[PDB]
Design a protein around this ligand. Structure first.
Ligand SMILES: [Mg+2]
Ligand SMILES: [Mg+2]
Length: 76
RNA sequence: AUAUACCGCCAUCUUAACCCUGAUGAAGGCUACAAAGUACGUUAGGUCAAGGUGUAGCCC
């Protein structure tokens, strides 16, 4: 949601451009166009910090996994 | 004599594209503590005094 409590225009724009979307959807949000909605609290700093930590860890681990798989493939 | 011959000079008057919204209607698109917007003619004009080119008049 944007600062007038309406959906972020980027949701509809990404749907138009066929870009998958992951999203934290609170009880007052619209999850219809988010490809992978995640119901949860988006206001408390603890929840937002947890979301950031989880996503950062997942992305970093995925990139490291790709690099080590490529290294193993090159070695073998 | 003629600018009521022309110039020279003064003066008069006329006169692109793109992207979104509306159910893809005419149509619309902004908020910064940001909410779709970005890329010349005219005149029986004057002036031959600090300028010129012609044209006609008269020649017991
Ligand atoms: Mg909320
Ligand atoms: Mg005159």
């Amino acid at each position: 949601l944007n600062n007038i409590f309406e959906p972020h225009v980027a949701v509809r724009d990404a749907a138009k451009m066929n870009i998958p979307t992951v999203g934290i959807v609170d009880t007052n949000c619209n999850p219809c166009l988010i490809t992978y909605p995640v119901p949860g609290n988006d206001d408390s700093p603890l929840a937002v910090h947890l979301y950031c930590r989880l996503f950062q860890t997942a992305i970093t681990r995925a990139k490291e996994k790709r690099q080590q798989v490529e290294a193993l493939y090159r070695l073998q």
